[model samples]
Target: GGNSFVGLRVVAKWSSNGYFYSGKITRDVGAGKYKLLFDDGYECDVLGKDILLCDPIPLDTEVTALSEDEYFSAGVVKGHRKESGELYYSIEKEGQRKWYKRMAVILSLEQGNRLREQYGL
Candidate 1:
Protein backbone atom coordinates (compact mmCIF):
# COMPACT_ATOMS: atom_id res chain seq x y z
CA GLY A 1 0.00 0.00 0.00
CA GLY A 2 1.10 3.55 -0.68
CA ASN A 3 0.61 6.55 1.57
CA SER A 4 0.74 10.30 1.28
CA PHE A 5 3.41 12.23 3.12
CA VAL A 6 5.00 15.58 3.63
CA GLY A 7 8.49 16.86 4.24
CA LEU A 8 9.04 19.71 6.70
CA ARG A 9 12.05 21.81 7.50
CA VAL A 10 12.39 23.80 10.71
CA VAL A 11 15.23 26.14 11.35
CA ALA A 12 16.71 27.27 14.65
CA LYS A 13 19.48 29.67 15.24
CA TRP A 14 22.44 29.73 17.57
CA SER A 15 22.72 32.85 19.67
CA SER A 16 26.46 32.57 20.10
CA ASN A 17 27.45 32.43 16.47
CA GLY A 18 24.23 33.65 14.82
CA TYR A 19 24.26 30.51 12.70
CA PHE A 20 21.10 28.83 11.50
CA TYR A 21 20.40 25.11 11.54
CA SER A 22 17.60 23.29 9.81
CA GLY A 23 15.74 20.12 10.57
CA LYS A 24 14.18 18.08 7.80
CA ILE A 25 11.33 15.71 8.48
CA THR A 26 8.93 13.57 6.49
CA ARG A 27 5.44 12.89 7.75
CA ASP A 28 3.00 10.36 6.34
CA VAL A 29 -0.69 10.87 6.49
CA GLY A 30 -2.83 8.31 4.62
CA ALA A 31 -3.88 8.75 0.89
CA GLY A 32 -2.32 10.43 -2.11
CA LYS A 33 -2.14 13.98 -0.82
CA TYR A 34 0.95 15.49 0.65
CA LYS A 35 2.55 18.71 1.73
CA LEU A 36 6.07 19.98 2.15
CA LEU A 37 7.03 22.66 4.65
CA PHE A 38 10.37 24.32 4.28
CA ASP A 39 12.42 26.15 6.86
CA ASP A 40 12.34 29.38 4.91
CA GLY A 41 8.60 29.67 5.49
CA TYR A 42 7.66 27.92 2.28
CA GLU A 43 5.03 25.20 2.00
CA CYS A 44 3.96 23.21 -1.03
CA ASP A 45 1.32 20.60 -1.56
CA VAL A 46 1.89 17.43 -3.55
CA LEU A 47 -1.19 15.61 -4.70
CA GLY A 48 -1.62 12.29 -6.45
CA LYS A 49 2.01 11.41 -6.07
CA ASP A 50 3.64 8.17 -5.04
CA ILE A 51 5.42 7.96 -1.75
CA LEU A 52 9.17 7.73 -2.03
CA LEU A 53 10.75 4.66 -0.57
CA CYS A 54 14.41 4.06 -0.10
CA ASP A 55 15.73 0.81 -1.42
CA PRO A 56 18.60 -1.01 0.19
CA ILE A 57 21.57 0.03 -1.87
CA PRO A 58 25.26 -0.09 -1.21
CA LEU A 59 26.88 3.09 0.07
CA ASP A 60 27.79 5.65 -2.60
CA THR A 61 25.24 4.26 -5.02
CA GLU A 62 24.16 6.76 -7.64
CA VAL A 63 20.67 5.58 -8.35
CA THR A 64 19.00 9.01 -8.42
CA ALA A 65 21.22 10.20 -11.29
CA LEU A 66 21.18 13.70 -9.85
CA SER A 67 23.98 16.15 -9.56
CA GLU A 68 26.13 15.57 -6.51
CA ASP A 69 27.17 18.20 -4.02
CA GLU A 70 30.94 18.32 -4.02
CA TYR A 71 31.19 18.94 -0.28
CA PHE A 72 28.76 16.19 0.70
CA SER A 73 29.78 13.75 3.41
CA ALA A 74 27.44 11.72 5.55
CA GLY A 75 27.94 9.44 8.53
CA VAL A 76 25.32 7.59 10.53
CA VAL A 77 25.30 6.40 14.13
CA LYS A 78 22.62 3.93 15.19
CA GLY A 79 21.84 2.26 18.47
CA HIS A 80 19.02 0.87 20.57
CA ARG A 81 18.47 0.98 24.32
CA LYS A 82 17.08 -2.06 26.06
CA GLU A 83 16.09 -0.57 29.38
CA SER A 84 14.29 2.40 27.93
CA GLY A 85 13.21 0.40 24.88
CA GLU A 86 14.20 3.21 22.55
CA LEU A 87 15.68 3.11 19.07
CA TYR A 88 17.83 5.96 17.81
CA TYR A 89 19.67 6.90 14.67
CA SER A 90 21.84 9.90 13.94
CA ILE A 91 23.14 11.08 10.64
CA GLU A 92 25.85 13.65 10.03
CA LYS A 93 25.89 15.54 6.77
CA GLU A 94 28.56 18.06 5.99
CA GLY A 95 29.74 18.06 9.62
CA GLN A 96 26.22 18.48 11.08
CA ARG A 97 24.53 15.61 12.84
CA LYS A 98 21.30 15.19 14.75
CA TRP A 99 19.91 12.20 16.58
CA TYR A 100 16.28 11.19 16.39
CA LYS A 101 14.80 8.83 18.92
CA ARG A 102 11.70 6.69 18.95
CA MET A 103 10.36 5.11 22.11
CA ALA A 104 8.78 1.66 22.19
CA VAL A 105 5.70 1.13 24.27
CA ILE A 106 3.10 -1.56 24.60
CA LEU A 107 -0.23 -0.14 23.60
CA SER A 108 -2.02 -2.01 26.38
CA LEU A 109 -1.28 -4.46 29.13
CA GLU A 110 -3.48 -6.97 27.30
CA GLN A 111 -1.30 -6.63 24.26
CA GLY A 112 1.85 -7.25 26.31
CA ASN A 113 0.19 -10.18 28.07
CA ARG A 114 -0.91 -11.69 24.80
CA LEU A 115 2.58 -11.36 23.38
CA ARG A 116 4.09 -12.90 26.46
CA GLU A 117 1.63 -15.75 26.40
CA GLN A 118 2.11 -16.48 22.73
CA TYR A 119 5.84 -15.88 22.29
CA GLY A 120 7.18 -15.93 25.87
CA LEU A 121 9.13 -12.72 25.30
Candidate 2:
Protein backbone atom coordinates (compact mmCIF):
# COMPACT_ATOMS: atom_id res chain seq x y z
CA GLY A 1 0.00 0.00 0.00
CA GLY A 2 1.83 3.10 -1.21
CA ASN A 3 1.55 6.11 -3.43
CA SER A 4 4.50 7.58 -5.30
CA PHE A 5 3.72 11.04 -6.57
CA VAL A 6 3.93 11.42 -10.32
CA GLY A 7 6.81 13.43 -11.81
CA LEU A 8 8.99 13.55 -8.70
CA ARG A 9 12.60 14.53 -9.42
CA VAL A 10 15.52 13.48 -7.21
CA VAL A 11 18.02 15.89 -8.82
CA ALA A 12 16.73 18.99 -7.10
CA LYS A 13 19.15 21.31 -5.20
CA TRP A 14 17.02 20.84 -2.09
CA SER A 15 19.29 22.90 0.17
CA SER A 16 22.53 20.94 -0.55
CA ASN A 17 24.22 18.57 -2.95
CA GLY A 18 23.80 14.86 -2.19
CA TYR A 19 22.67 11.47 -3.36
CA PHE A 20 18.98 10.78 -3.32
CA TYR A 21 16.70 7.95 -4.14
CA SER A 22 13.16 7.35 -5.56
CA GLY A 23 14.56 9.13 -8.60
CA LYS A 24 12.59 11.12 -11.12
CA ILE A 25 9.21 9.63 -11.69
CA THR A 26 8.62 8.66 -15.32
CA ARG A 27 5.42 6.56 -14.90
CA ASP A 28 3.54 4.00 -12.87
CA VAL A 29 2.37 0.69 -14.25
CA GLY A 30 1.82 -2.80 -12.90
CA ALA A 31 3.57 -5.94 -14.06
CA GLY A 32 2.18 -7.80 -17.02
CA LYS A 33 2.79 -11.23 -15.54
CA TYR A 34 5.57 -10.92 -12.97
CA LYS A 35 7.69 -10.54 -16.14
CA LEU A 36 8.36 -8.51 -19.25
CA LEU A 37 6.02 -6.46 -21.39
CA PHE A 38 5.65 -5.58 -25.05
CA ASP A 39 7.13 -2.09 -24.47
CA ASP A 40 10.22 -3.49 -22.77
CA GLY A 41 13.38 -1.95 -24.11
CA TYR A 42 15.54 -4.86 -23.04
CA GLU A 43 14.93 -8.52 -22.42
CA CYS A 44 13.68 -7.88 -18.87
CA ASP A 45 12.86 -4.29 -18.10
CA VAL A 46 11.64 -2.61 -14.88
CA LEU A 47 9.89 0.50 -16.12
CA GLY A 48 6.54 -1.28 -16.06
CA LYS A 49 7.08 -3.85 -13.38
CA ASP A 50 7.90 -4.49 -9.75
CA ILE A 51 11.44 -4.62 -8.39
CA LEU A 52 13.20 -4.09 -5.10
CA LEU A 53 15.96 -1.51 -4.65
CA CYS A 54 17.66 -1.57 -1.30
CA ASP A 55 21.31 -1.01 -0.30
CA PRO A 56 23.81 -2.53 2.13
CA ILE A 57 21.90 -5.80 2.02
CA PRO A 58 22.82 -8.27 4.73
CA LEU A 59 24.35 -11.75 4.41
CA ASP A 60 22.51 -15.03 5.04
CA THR A 61 19.40 -13.24 3.87
CA GLU A 62 19.17 -15.46 0.81
CA VAL A 63 20.50 -14.65 -2.67
CA THR A 64 19.55 -15.70 -6.14
CA ALA A 65 19.86 -14.68 -9.78
CA LEU A 66 17.14 -12.66 -11.39
CA SER A 67 17.31 -14.97 -14.38
CA GLU A 68 19.05 -18.29 -14.87
CA ASP A 69 19.62 -17.20 -18.45
CA GLU A 70 21.88 -14.46 -17.12
CA TYR A 71 23.82 -15.58 -14.03
CA PHE A 72 25.00 -18.15 -11.58
CA SER A 73 24.76 -18.27 -7.81
CA ALA A 74 28.44 -17.39 -8.04
CA GLY A 75 28.49 -15.50 -11.30
CA VAL A 76 29.05 -11.82 -12.09
CA VAL A 77 26.70 -9.30 -13.65
CA LYS A 78 28.53 -7.37 -16.38
CA GLY A 79 26.41 -4.31 -15.73
CA HIS A 80 28.01 -3.52 -12.36
CA ARG A 81 31.57 -4.31 -13.36
CA LYS A 82 34.07 -1.47 -13.57
CA GLU A 83 37.80 -0.76 -13.47
CA SER A 84 40.08 2.28 -13.36
CA GLY A 85 43.24 1.50 -11.35
CA GLU A 86 42.10 -0.88 -8.63
CA LEU A 87 38.92 -2.75 -9.36
CA TYR A 88 35.92 -1.55 -7.40
CA TYR A 89 34.17 -4.36 -5.56
CA SER A 90 36.26 -6.79 -7.56
CA ILE A 91 38.58 -9.63 -6.64
CA GLU A 92 41.12 -11.79 -8.43
CA LYS A 93 40.31 -15.45 -8.42
CA GLU A 94 42.28 -18.03 -10.42
CA GLY A 95 44.24 -15.38 -12.38
CA GLN A 96 41.08 -13.68 -13.61
CA ARG A 97 39.39 -10.47 -12.52
CA LYS A 98 35.98 -11.24 -11.05
CA TRP A 99 33.34 -9.22 -9.33
CA TYR A 100 30.51 -10.77 -7.40
CA LYS A 101 27.00 -9.46 -7.86
CA ARG A 102 26.71 -8.81 -4.15
CA MET A 103 24.10 -6.14 -4.53
CA ALA A 104 21.96 -8.55 -6.48
CA VAL A 105 21.84 -10.65 -3.34
CA ILE A 106 19.82 -10.58 -0.21
CA LEU A 107 22.69 -10.07 2.22
CA SER A 108 22.89 -10.49 5.96
CA LEU A 109 23.97 -7.95 8.55
CA GLU A 110 27.16 -9.85 9.33
CA GLN A 111 28.14 -9.97 5.66
CA GLY A 112 27.50 -6.30 5.15
CA ASN A 113 29.86 -5.43 8.00
CA ARG A 114 32.51 -7.76 6.66
CA LEU A 115 32.31 -6.17 3.20
CA ARG A 116 32.79 -2.71 4.70
CA GLU A 117 35.68 -3.90 6.79
CA GLN A 118 37.28 -5.63 3.80
CA TYR A 119 37.40 -2.38 1.74
CA GLY A 120 36.86 0.31 4.36
CA LEU A 121 33.59 1.01 2.59
In model 2, what lDDT does residue 111 have?
Answer: 27
The TM-score, computed over Cα atoms with residue i paired to residue i, of candidate 2 is: 0.23
Off by over 4 Å in 1: 1-31, 48-70, 77-89, 92-121
lDDT of 1 by residue, 1-121 (tens): 2222233332222223432222222444335444434334544443322112221111322111111354223343332232364333343445564444321111122222222222220
Error of 2 at 20 (Å): 23
Candidate 2 local lDDT, residue 93? 31
Flag clash pairs in model 2.
Answer: 58-107, 58-108, 59-107, 59-108
Residue-wise lDDT of candidate 2 within 23-91, one digit each (tens)? 233444454211221112222223221222222222222322332466434322233343452222333
TM-scores for every predicted model: 0.24, 0.23
RMSD of each: 16.8, 13.5
Residue 114 displacement (Å), model 2: 23
